[PDB]
Amino acid sequence: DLFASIGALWTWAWRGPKARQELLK
Amino acid sequence: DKTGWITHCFGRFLIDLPPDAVINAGYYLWGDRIEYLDDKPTELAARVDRLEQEWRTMFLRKIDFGNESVGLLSWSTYLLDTYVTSKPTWHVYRWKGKVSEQHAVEISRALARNLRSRAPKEIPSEPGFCIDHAYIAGDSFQVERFGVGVTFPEHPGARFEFRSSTGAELNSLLERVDGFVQNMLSTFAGMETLRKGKHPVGSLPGEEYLVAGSDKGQRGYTFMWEVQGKEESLTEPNLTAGLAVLERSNPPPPAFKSDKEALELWDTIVDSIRVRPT
């Protein structure tokens, strides 16, 4: 699904490892 | 077309935003949030007394950091709950984190010395990291980070995000997402890449990746900009800007009139990012 892919990209795939840990705190 | 736009300070940086922008920001020092409280002096003293009463109903020690600033040390490793004030104008900030001791008290002490107030429309000339109504004065290295969320009344469904964080990211933006986007583009004919490559802003070496797609009667966007960052640098941390329009439920009104409008807002904001001159 197109918007599900866009959402995956925005919420997780473009976030680097350091930025992922920070967002999850 | 930057009529009425406002220059904002976040951390070490400035960015320009349209006047009706709705803004939310968080700030983090050595990994823990530094939160603005609207306590007046007696209200802060009352808050501290309540917390000490509760920790007694576990508690260990109350610590004077000097400047009407105080911290409570308890068990969580300890928990150090620091309350620090800006000068000259009174504002209170809470800064709470876990501690394994003399080192953390010294950091709180330096915070209480270094925390300066700033007026609403003020862009400080002194070095330091801007937070709500204040800035942490100085230019020695510290772990520091912020995140800003922004919405625009004229672009329903659009969200913009601006972040800095000390330390290099482990990969670059194009390395990180190119395979993912390519798989999207080969799966969905409504999906296109608008731009891919570099978007320097002065000396900031930003990588950039802009995608858009149409489905279910709507057009969505994901615009991405990143400076990978350098270790132990205040002024070239990891730095990111993003703009997204995702799926909204019913056919909802467009966020933008056209890709060009979206790209113009994006470029105007991104090209206004700069280290605060000090």
Residue numbers in the entry:
A (entry chain B): 83 to 107
B (entry chain A): 34 to 90, 99 to 117, 124 to 147, 151 to 300, 305 to 332
Sentences from the study reporting this entry:
P. aeruginosa encodes three distinct T6SS hemolysin coregulated protein (Hcp) secretion islands (named H1-to H3-T6SS) that act against both prokaryotic and eukaryotic cells. TplE is an antibacterial lipolytic toxin and TplEi interacts with TplE to provide protection from TplE. TplE, a new T6SS trans-kingdom toxin, targets the conserved and essential cell membranes of rival bacteria to cause bacteriolysis, while TplEi functions as a cognate immunity protein to prevent self-intoxication.
As anticipated, after 30 days of proteolysis and crystallization, we first observed crystals growing from the subtilisin-treated TplE-TplEi complex sample, and crystals diffracted the X rays to 2.2Å. Surprisingly, the majority of TplEi was intact, whereas TplE had been degraded except for a 27 residue fragment that remained bound to TplEi. Residues 82-108 of TplE is comprised α1 and α2 helices that are connected by a disordered loop region. Because α1 is significantly longer than α2 and the two helices are nearly perpendicular to each other, the peptide exhibits a “L” shape, thus, we designated it as “L” peptide based on its shape.
